Structure formats: structure tokens, C-alpha cells
Amino acid sequence: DHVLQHWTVDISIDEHEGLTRAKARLRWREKELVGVGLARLNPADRNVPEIGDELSVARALSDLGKRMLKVSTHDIEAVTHQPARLLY
Template sequence: MHTRKWSVDVFLSEEEDRTHAIARLHTAAGELTADGTARRNPADRDVPEIGDELAAARALSALAHRLLDTVVGDIEGVTHRPVHLDR
């Protein structure tokens, strides 16, 4: 059995009513990065954890889509045929 470790870092920053997240996947082959943003409605209570969670979720979702796009490109590079993955 061969075990590999991948890690994901999520960086969060907040400015006024916006929270921005960057998700970075580290693998032996390299790195993929995606981002996400959450904006608080001025009428809502200021609960930073909610903005962090939403921005991080959006960044991780975008990262998952980037990884799927990478997989498609890798498969097409090997098979020389179009690939359509179910998402």
C-alpha cells in the first residue's frame, strides 16, 4: 500500500463587511488555489464566524471544481479524447 498526503490551507481575511478566503491544495505534483468571498448585509448582526464559514465554503467549493477541471485535463492528455465527468 502506498499512502500520499495532501493538505489544504485556508486563509481568511476580513475587511469591513466582507470576508475573503483563499484555499490552497498542496500535493506532490504542485498546488491549486481558489478563493471565495462572503459579504454581510449591513442590516445583519456582525457574526464573524458566519462570514468565515461562508467564504471558506465558497473557496473550498471553487477548489474542488478546479481539481475536477485538472482531472479532466489529465485524463484527456492521456486518452486524447474528450472527457465529461458527472459533477
């Protein structure tokens, strides 16, 4: 009675000179998105690169989810033929 699926987000993390850039790619059906996030270390945490990693990724995933809400909106509008906007 349930229909189950499994998807994957691929995340790249690039640390360079205290700047960490994350890119989170998701492909599904007819769509593909990349969420992007940045985190820069400061003197107080410059020796804790794990913070830059997880913060840039948090941002990339949030960006990805935001972009996906927009795709969802476009698909709903295609069905209803009425403008829509999803806030959450």
C-alpha cells in the same frame, strides 16, 4: 495492500469592513490550485463574523474542488487522448 497519503489545504481568511475573502491553496504532484470565496455580511448578521468566515471558506473549497475536477479532466485526456469532461 493499501497505499495511504495525506495532503493539506491551506486557507487564508481576510475580513475587512464586512467583506470576508477566503483563499484555499492545494499543491500536489505537478499541480497547484487556489480556490477563492467571498462572503459579505449584511446588517442582519453584521455582528456575526463567523458566518462570513465559514461561508467564504465554503465557497473557496467548492471553487478549489471545481478547479481540481478540471485538472483531473486534463490528466485523463492526456492518458486517453480523447476529450473529456467531469461534471462531478
